[PDB]
């Protein structure tokens, strides 16, 4: 039992609108560390609120908590004008590396909750700090906190093709199981129908906009595949284009499908989409003469650690806010501004929660640090990240069915059994943390979509092309 | 028990130097059918057998069966002047289609030997056919022999990257054993360390010469690897480049490596390469200015079915000659020139034995044609496909250890296990043929590596770096 390389009264594990916007709620009264993984740098009227509420009820297709639905759509046009109010009309980065009680810990890795009954502490179960990989100094080091906030995004890190990748390695969901709390609905993972598919792509994405301005979709010949899945055609609900796409890719041996613009005038896509034309001219591609090789990408998990108004998780101490949590305001599906509603909702109410709240304490026992070195099962372990990562991609994608979830879980278990018996108290590196929290994620996930026996919002399996009479989350307990 | 579609003296599978010398040996005495998987268009003296011998045993690292190593040797100058007499001063396809008692039935997949005492017949245990898939008539046909000679080839397509894919998918090693037949020493699998890494390389390869000429090896950085590796530095040993370049590759993620003479004077590649420098031109490569992108790819197979000096397995009437047997000529590696010396001494030893050992019968079972269809499987058999050969590439691949043997093998019993469980009975067709015969054989390859506490010839072991005191093949047994 050590003193603690880094104390405060609240830890917050990520730092995108959730993570700051919360930080900047309580600096003002407390002493607060944001954990960052790379640099930090890189409602008026009645009758719309009422709208909201019935649009998110309809696009989650069924199963929200509608005492949820409606927490979030009362108390967003407050959760924006703060935003206004801070002189953010984006991001919070410049307000809050300006506050003088926000500290910043860059290029750091949460590697697990430290929770009291465990480290052979008394009294109820609760959290009191992180053990976190520092990359600057190489080192694990503890931070003891008061409460610990887990606001890291989600897990679309476990499948190949992700939109946005530093936000979805599944860290905070897969810490928040290890320290005991329960998860749900991570069967709804939403996929982009239209990524870039090239090898400086950036993850840059290719907008609906294209194809509302006529853009088509097609097939390595050159042939046009919607009109075979739907009479929208390229307009189709964007969960039915990626299903398409999908379909296609697995269905043909194909690396990608395409997006063509080009049967249409120049300057009338030059005027149209200049910053996408000049992008993919820095590439080699002419948006006015050839097809855009595309992919659908995982975008998005409705599902995660499950959360009460006020995002608390089920261990004391321990929230957890936004796209990293299940709160039941989503559903089965998300509804464009939800996100971002409940990022700054959820991040308002843990904010007065944790203020109320807040018995100090303690000094705690220091990481392990099993120091083993073998470069050669070292370059496994970055086998075995891709390998999950692909298998992920044709077992719990975006079309399923029971014989290929089957295969994930087959696949799933076999990687958590080399897991324990060949990197034991090896020493920890970032590949290696990623590796078993997507393992640990990936499990969730397949656990969840074999528990529903329908299609529902982004579950669509063909072996249950309908839905259920009654239905709701899918809910596992460690 | 039917009519077979099919019915001849002698039933070759497979159509290279060894299938039609043999073919053309036998043809003017006997009816024989050549199986082609496609089309099937597309020593003077003594010192120096002395020589032949020797070298042959230096290259074979210390396993070399010498008796086998002569019998090739003393018998190659008059298997090569019958290639002389033949016209073909090349291929054979000409000569035997204009033989009127070889019949060739092309786009054609042989799935199982009949085996006597399999089909309820009585007697010695012996081959008498084959059931044969018909790619044109959509069939599995039956196929009557009084001899059948397997000619297919090797098992190099186990792995992603492979030199000569049409004459690598396994199936005559996969057949034989199935059959009852021994396999010996398939851990010894050559990889040529430098193939063309493109989408339409069509396995093009550059050639050692690129590097006697002065071209470098370069990481994707730009800079040189070998003197890292080797003294010898771009001329060492091919096994040498062909690891370098494999530790490289895993070393740092990347997808291939650089092959560069640019650096030289341009007419000195015009005139010193054309053939290769139009090829890469005409992909959009200059061989004058930039570096070339390689993998190293498998190549050929040391090991395989076993058999005497008259190309004889375990199993009366069944043959095996050339790459897909395992003589002892061979050792742990392949002098050039040897490859082809087999080829045409073992279809001249065949012929011989085949002839004087010409007793007819028989009708026989047809096969079962289970017609099971589920699209969506379909598309799996496919996936399991890539992900054998990408697992067998990191696992029993250029560089071994034993941790990735194992985790090779429990891959493999997995896969062996899901096509038992889902794919039983399903109709045969050419993807699921090639997934299960390159599934067997991928078990044979890690069991043979497994086996082996040393690391001599193309079997090289980071935990077993020095040779044996005392060696010999590896030898499985049904």
Known sequence: NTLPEHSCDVLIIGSGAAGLSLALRLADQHQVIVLSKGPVTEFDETDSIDSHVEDTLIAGAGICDRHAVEFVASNARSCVQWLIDQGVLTTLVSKALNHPNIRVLERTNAVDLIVSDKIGLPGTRRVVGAWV????????ETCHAKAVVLAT???????????????????????????????????????????????????????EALRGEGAYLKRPDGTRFMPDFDERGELAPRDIVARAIDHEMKRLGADCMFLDISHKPADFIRQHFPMIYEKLLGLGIDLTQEPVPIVPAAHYTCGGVMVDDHGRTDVEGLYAIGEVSYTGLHGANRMASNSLLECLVYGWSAAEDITRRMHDISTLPPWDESRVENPDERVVIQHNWHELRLFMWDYVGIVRTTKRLERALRRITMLQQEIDEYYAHFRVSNNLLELRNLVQVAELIVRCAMMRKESRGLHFTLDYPELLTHSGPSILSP
Chains 1, 2 share one sequence.
Not at 133 to 140: A, C, H, I, L
Request: proline letters at 5%; glycine letters at 8%; a positive charge.
């Open 133 to 140: 990989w520092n990359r600057n100094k190489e080192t694990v």
């Open 153 to 207: 995004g989600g897990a679309s890190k476990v499948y190949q093709y992700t939109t946005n990748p530093d936000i979805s390695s599944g860290d905070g969901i897969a810490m928040a199981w290890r320290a005991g709390c329960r998860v749900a609905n991570l069967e709804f993972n939403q996929f982009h129908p239209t990524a870039l598919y090239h090898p400086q792509a950036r993850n840059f994405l290719l907008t």
